[PDB]
Design a protein around this ligand. Structure first.
Ligand SMILES: CC(C)c1c(NC(=O)Nc2cnc(-n3nccn3)c(Cl)c2)cnc2cc(Cl)nn12
Ligand SMILES: [Ca+2]
Ligand SMILES: [Ca+2]
Ligand SMILES: [Ca+2]
Ligand SMILES: [Ca+2]
Length: 356
């Protein structure tokens, strides 16, 4: 068959405020978005959403689900279940959980089933609490997937490894064209298909469509990365300031000295003074690999020799992304290093441009 569009939303919640902090979602969201973009999906990938951010994100995904489109929703993070109703827990949720602070899976699912979409895929990779087992209880083209592990230890053991994410295996094996570890865990996959649907089905391809143009530009607005800069410093140094997206809400910056002038024999440069809403620890800025910042991106896909800084949390940017690049310089016979600065405005990078 054909897809009228291919749209995907991936949420990975990790940095929980009142609950144990998970680690696996970063990896598996990155890997699955890589897969999905190779399958022609436009993808949003958001780490660490609070209830409000998470609800706004899901609502705009649901607003893109239209007659004939193929929609994938993926969640990883803490979940709970009560009485047949499963809940995705946002990172700001209190302890104990409540339904009031959480997004109910079944509500998203009944809204996905409403649309007359050509394929709905909804995959959940939940860490349950230890004792939170299933309860005693009494369409469109749909694939529902639901994985559980009991406890963060079992979750993080089973998700340890590269490439071994349950739903990425499932989609590769079953929707195109990892040892069992200790603990309690479960997988549920349910499907109802009128005809065969696959993620490799062509998009119904338009030369001349306003609707297609709107869909592409609405997503592309949320993914404008800053136009990489080279800063002139008046002492004759030039510092190159480069950018990369790791997620829709995570940007890596990389600073490098592109040259020193004749008179300067020692030079060093770095970034500081980021917006407070992003909560950047400066010990996790200015590192000598992007791996040291906590990025999936490596020093062999990002360019060499830079100081690397990871700006996560870009959806929390109230205003403009503004920072100071600092220079240290030392003249050919001088006893002391000179310091210099310039302030950079970087705009509203990535999902920060939605301004919500
Ligand atoms: C419309 C487009 C950008 C889009 C989404 N939109 C959002 O995720 N919107 C959002 C809206 N608001 C907040 N937010 N509220 C407060 C702080 N952050 C966030 Cl995180 C996300 C979501 N999923 C998809 C998939 C495709 Cl394909 N496109 N797309
Ligand atoms: Ca239960
Ligand atoms: Ca993994
Ligand atoms: Ca604002
Ligand atoms: Ca001095």
């Amino acid at each position: 068959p054909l897809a009228k569009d291919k749209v995907a939303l991936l949420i990975g919640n990790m940095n929980y405020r009142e609950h144990p902090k998970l680690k696996a979602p970063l990896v598996d969201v990155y890997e699955l978005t890589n897969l999905l973009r190779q399958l022609d999906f436009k993808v949003v990938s958001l780490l660490d959403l609070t209830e409000y951010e998470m609800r706004n994100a899901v609502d705009e995904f649901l607003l893109l689900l239209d007659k004939g489109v193929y929609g994938l929703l993926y969640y990883a993070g803490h979940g709970y279940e009560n009485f047949g109703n499963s809940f995705m827990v946002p990172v700001d949720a209190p302890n104990p959980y409540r339904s009031e602070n959480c997004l109910c899976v079944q509500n998203i699912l009944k809204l996905m089933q409403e649309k007359e979409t050509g394929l709905n895929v909804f995959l959940l990779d939940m860490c349950r609490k230890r004792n939170d087992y299933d309860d005693t209880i009494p369409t469109a083209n749909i694939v529902f997937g639901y994985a559980t592990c009991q406890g963060a230890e079992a979750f993080e053991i089973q998700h340890s490894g590269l490439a071994n994410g349950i739903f990425m295996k499932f989609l590769k094996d079953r929707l195109l064209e990892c040892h069992l570890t200790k603990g309690k865990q479960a997988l549920e996959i349910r499907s109802s298909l009128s005809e065969k649907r696959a993620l490799t089905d062509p998009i119904q391809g338009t030369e001349y469509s306003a609707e297609s143009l709107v869909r592409n530009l609405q997503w592309a607005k949320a993914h404008e990365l800053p136009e990489s800069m080279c800063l002139k410093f008046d002492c004759g140094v030039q510092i190159q300031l480069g950018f990369a997206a790791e997620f829709s809400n995570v940007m890596i910056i990389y600073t490098s000295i592109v040259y020193k002038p004749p008179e300067i024999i020692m030079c060093d440069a770095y970034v500081t003074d980021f917006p407070l809403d992003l909560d950047i620890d400066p010990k996790d800025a200015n590192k000598g690999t992007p791996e040291e910042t906590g990025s999936y991106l490596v020093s062999k896909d990002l360019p060499k020799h830079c100081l690397y800084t990871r700006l996560s949390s870009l959806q929390k940017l109230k205003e403009h992304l503004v920072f100071t690049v600092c220079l240290s310089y030392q003249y050919s016979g001088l006893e002391d290093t000179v310091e210099d600065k310039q302030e950079v405005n970087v705009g509203k990078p990535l999902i920060a441009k939605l301004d919500m």
